Amino acid sequence: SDCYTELEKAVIVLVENFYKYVSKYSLVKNKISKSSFREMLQKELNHMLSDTGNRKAADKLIQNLDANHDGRISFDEYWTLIGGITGPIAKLIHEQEQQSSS
């Protein structure tokens, strides 16, 4: 434990959910599905986003990614998915931290 940064832990928190989902949430020799991918991001980002309206922002990304017929989510293929969410609302994010308030 004991030495890793919170940035290290944050890159890790994005890999926790990757391995969680790729593995256990059906099958580890490989099942996933871009349906439950849209729910998983709604468990974990339950407060990041302002509405059903804001959902379409992630739904456009979720479309533009694994409409690819590989049956794989890859490490950075999972990242650009939510890195593309983290731009329009990322203005409010900075604001929260620079004011430290929430």
Q: Which stretch binds Ca ion (CB under 5 A): 11-19, 31-39, 45-53, 84-92?
A: 31-39
With H, G, I as helix, E, B as strand and everything else as coil, classify residue 16: helix
**50 touching a second copy, by CB under 8 A:** no
Q: How far is CA 43 from the centre of its chain?
A: 10
30 is in an annotated binding site: no
Binding residue for Ca ion (CB under 5 A) from 36, 42, 63, 68?
68
- Residue 92 CA to residue 48 CA, distance in Å, equals 9
Residue 34 near residue 66 (C-beta atoms within 8 A): yes
Binding residue for Ca ion (CB under 5 A) from 9, 31, 38, 60?
31
Residues of this chain that bind Ca ion (CB under 5 A) = 25-27, 31, 66, 68, 70, 72
